[PDB]
Subunit: 325 residues, 2 copies
């Protein structure tokens, strides 16, 4: 029985205050139409990468506006953090949400964004592991550099709700060995530019599952791009600009893509765009979704209006969800 | 025209999740009875000192439950922070509150609490100044260790809402010189050999130095935080306070400071606790000459450990009976 999620990087058109108000309304609407979970991504210094450097602060605000929907980070860029303060903020936040928090961590990011935080991008893997260990130790209630110091508020329940974003078989084994959740990206570079995404991610799931300890339920988030509209032509119209932009970034990043057509972009950038009938059919071709415990949907790729996002949320809940829950 | 504030360290009896519920409800009630501002204190690792290590997270949550009341940190212990992440969280929070945020910073704290953050108490002042400088630069929009790094979201409006907590004339000069607000504490140790000196004799010289140091054109901002607990019955309020006040006296003595006597009256005078029914708390506040000079006055129960419902009534009585004297 799979959980359905709404994912946002907070990229709507407008000032940051407007982005935050539109994201909050989008999460509230997702809850209202029966989504199980909301996920928000952290991004620093770049209005076009994401609008939110402070996911724990924003989720505290949305928590007060919601009641049932679970609230998660996808992800906190842990190498770019003081890990003890993250531990405290998450410990407090989970209490304020009444147990709805999900803590997803990741290591990656734009190389120049690491510099303000006292490290380089080549150090991200080692720093991530150290920070994760510190956080786990704090939530467990170990002493913190002095026998008078223990984390307050306590958070023994939070270690069980850690998720790790990874792109690799090795990252998935480390997550599985620890009993953590696996977070799969909306898209990944190909080894063969036309390979389907499930050809890429099923080996990742395989390695994760084989590494779990006995007794740990698998947790697999499959995050996907979807933009659904009542008119199939409208959905393709909306997506064309954002998809061309995404294609240009993929090529400048050293990854080739065969073609210039929208249909070529939808396949190679893993964007499920159209009316409900067409989005159900493309999603059905992705065999990862049958293996995942949580499926999340984001417009990104696409830059729809706020109201078109509200409608996409509704259409996904009404027509998509029965096929994938 | 002075602003009236409600102040809490989040110390109600209960689990952390209950403390947060009760503090949120206390803040909403303060807004409801006409308080202008709410202030919350940051404390790490010690249930008895304060219940909240994450004031920016908690304020985002109560901001969604409130509408008019201003929301402030009193304080963020800046040496125990990654300063860029504070700069970011506060810039996001102010937008979430629609511009109601006040950002108070302080340096001090329990010495053992610094160690998990890679410094000692003795280093707190230098680290404070470095972190404050980084935050100020970030909010101004300067580049952050590289030309493609500027703070998002921008927060050019936040530098004008910085407050500094200090005990000393020198800290007050530094705050005034920068144009920051001055945050005065509910109590403070007396000069050597003068244990009965009134609190306004201590803090008035601090205000003098602050005001002399302000640049032209910067409006002074002075927060006077005070201990007050008000109840309908005078004896009930004194009954509630006595255990808390006794604990405070002993703590004050263990730290090496002088407390003359053991009576409640001695405690109320020397620990600066305004405790009683409205007529007696008004009369005792009217003796503190700082309150006429302050631009913001805040009231906390601490010292006292009242019930939540007694805290709600104290908030009501202050709004109804104390406020007209001091606004």
């Amino acid at each position: 029985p799979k959980r359905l999620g709404f994912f946002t990087r907070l990229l709507d058109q407008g000032s940051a205050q407007t982005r935050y108000r539109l994201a909050a309304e989008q999460i509230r609407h997702a809850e209202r139409v029966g989504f199980d979970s909301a996920w928000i991504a952290q991004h620093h210094f770049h209005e076009q990468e994401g609008g939110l450097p402070s996911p724990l602060v924003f989720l505290a605000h949305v928590a007060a506006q919601t009641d049932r929907i679970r609230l998660g980070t996808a992800i906190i860029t842990l190498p770019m953090e003081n890990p003890l303060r993250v531990a405290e903020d998450a410990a407090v936040l989970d209490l304020l949400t009444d147990g709805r928090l999900e803590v997803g961590f990741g290591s990656g990011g734009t190389p120049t964004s690491f510099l303000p935080f006292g490290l380089t991008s080549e150090q991200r893997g080692a720093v991530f592991a150290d920070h994760l260990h510190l956080i786990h130790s704090a939530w467990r209630g170990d002493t913190l550099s002095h026998p008078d110091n223990h984390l307050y508020p306590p958070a023994p329940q939070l270690a069980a709700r850690i998720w790790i974003a990874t792109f690799s078989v090795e990252g998935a084994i480390r997550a599985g060995q620890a009993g953590h959740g696996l977070m799969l990206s909306r898209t990944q570079p190909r080894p063969e530019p036309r390979l389907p995404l499930d050809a890429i991610q099923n080996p990742i799931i395989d390695a994760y599952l084989s590494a779990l300890p006995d007794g740990v339920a698998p947790r697999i988030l499959a995050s996907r791009t979807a933009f659904v509209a009542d008119s199939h032509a409208h959905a393709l119209q909306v997506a064309e600009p954002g998809l061309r932009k995404q294609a240009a970034q993929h090529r400048e990043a050293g990854h080739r893509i065969e073609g210039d057509s929208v249909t070529d972009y939808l396949q190679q950038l893993d964007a499920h765009v159209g009316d409900p009938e067409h989005v159900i059919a493309s999603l059905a071709q992705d065999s990862v979704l049958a293996r995942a415990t949580d499926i999340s949907f984001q417009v990104h790729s696409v830059e729809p209006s706020h109201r078109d996002t509200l409608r996409s949320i509704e259409l996904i809940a009404q027509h998509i969800a029965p096929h994938i829950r």
